[PDB]
Design a protein around this ligand. Structure first.
Ligand code: NDP
Ligand code: 63W
Length: 186
């Protein structure tokens, strides 16, 4: 098993969701970036694993479920099996990561990507160890009901560059946004 990573897109007021969707109109290239980053596995013959909360799962439209070419693991304490389309179910982030060091997965999983929501992100970000955050900054306020947790810049350093990640400001349906990569190791 290779890297542990979080990926999020966040508005300026730290908003990531609203009424079970994203706070902003769909940005096609942000979705394409998310796809590319989560799917791409630099260790031939392995797949990436995506870990998400239950609400995040159901927030993805049904025909795009499971996220293709990735092992999909949903986090729930209420569900008794993976939702229709989902591969794995865990009752905690620990168990999910614990589940990756088993026979079934340990030689199949490369990168693990936490793809939301808030409480998964929160727990990951505050877990000791080597962790990157791939943060798309949507450069406006958008009204939101769910938020990205605080990034502690004493521990997380913004990288000045990263391969395969555009540094330049992007714009789509009149909304400016930028890609960032943060790294901690503690
Ligand atoms: O965390 P989300 O996905 O779901 C909450 C639901 O998840 C289960 N949960 C969460 N965390 C754990 C867990 N279960 C076990 N262990 C852990 N650690 C739990 O389900 P149950 O009760 O059945 O056990 C929780 O209730 O939901 P959220 O934070 O409410 O977010 C969804 C919103 O944000 C948007 N979004 C999601 C991901 C990324 C981004 C982004 N912009 O990058 C946005 C969604 O659209 C939605 O609005
Ligand atoms: C969960 C998420 C979304 S929600 C979502 C994800 C995928 C799909 C589709 F590819 F299936 F369409 C739809 C909604 S956009 C996005 N962008 C970044 N940078 N990071 C993320 N974690 C997400």
């Amino acid at each position: 098993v290779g890297s542990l990573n979080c990926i999020v897109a966040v508005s300026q007021n730290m908003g990531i969701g609203k009424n079970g969707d994203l706070p902003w109109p769909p940005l096609r290239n942000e979705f394409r970036y998310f796809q590319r980053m989560t799917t791409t596995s630099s260790v031939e013959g392995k797949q990436n694993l995506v870990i998400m909360g239950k609400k995040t799962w159901f927030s993805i439209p049904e025909k795009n479920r499971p996220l293709k070419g990735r092992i999909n693991l949903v986090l729930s304490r209420e569900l008794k099996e993976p939702p229709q389309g989902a591969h794995f179910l865990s009752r905690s982030l620990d168990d999910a990561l614990k589940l990756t060091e088993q026979p079934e997965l340990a030689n199949k999983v490369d990168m693990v990507w936490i793809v939301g929501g808030s409480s998964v992100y929160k727990e990951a970000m505050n877990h000791p160890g080597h962790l990157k955050l791939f943060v798309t900054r949507i450069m406006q306020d958008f009204e939101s009901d769910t938020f990205f947790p605080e990034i502690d810049l004493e521990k997380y350093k913004l990288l000045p560059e990263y391969p395969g990640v555009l540094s330049d400001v992007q714009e789509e349906k009149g909304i400016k946004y930028k890609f960032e990569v943060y790294e901690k190791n503690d």
